[PDB]
A = this chain, B = another copy of it.
């Protein structure tokens, strides 16, 4: 029960990291 929840959390933070990379790329461009 707890394991999957923390896995869903790790996945959400990876999507967040992706979004901030995107943002970084939009600024440079």
**Residues of A participating in the B interface, judged by any CB pair closer than 8 Å:** 1-28
Contact = CB atoms under 8 A, between A and B. Distances in A.
How many copies the complex holds: the figure is 6
Given A2-B26, A5-B19, A26-B2, A12 B12 contact: yes
**Most chain B C-beta atoms within 10 Å of own C-beta, residue among A1, A16, A27:** A16
B3 A13 contact: no
Given A17-B17, A19-B5, A10 B26 contact: no
A21 to B, nearest CB: 5
Contacts of A26: 1-2, 5
Contacts of A20: 6-7, 9-10, 13
A7 B8 CA distance: 17
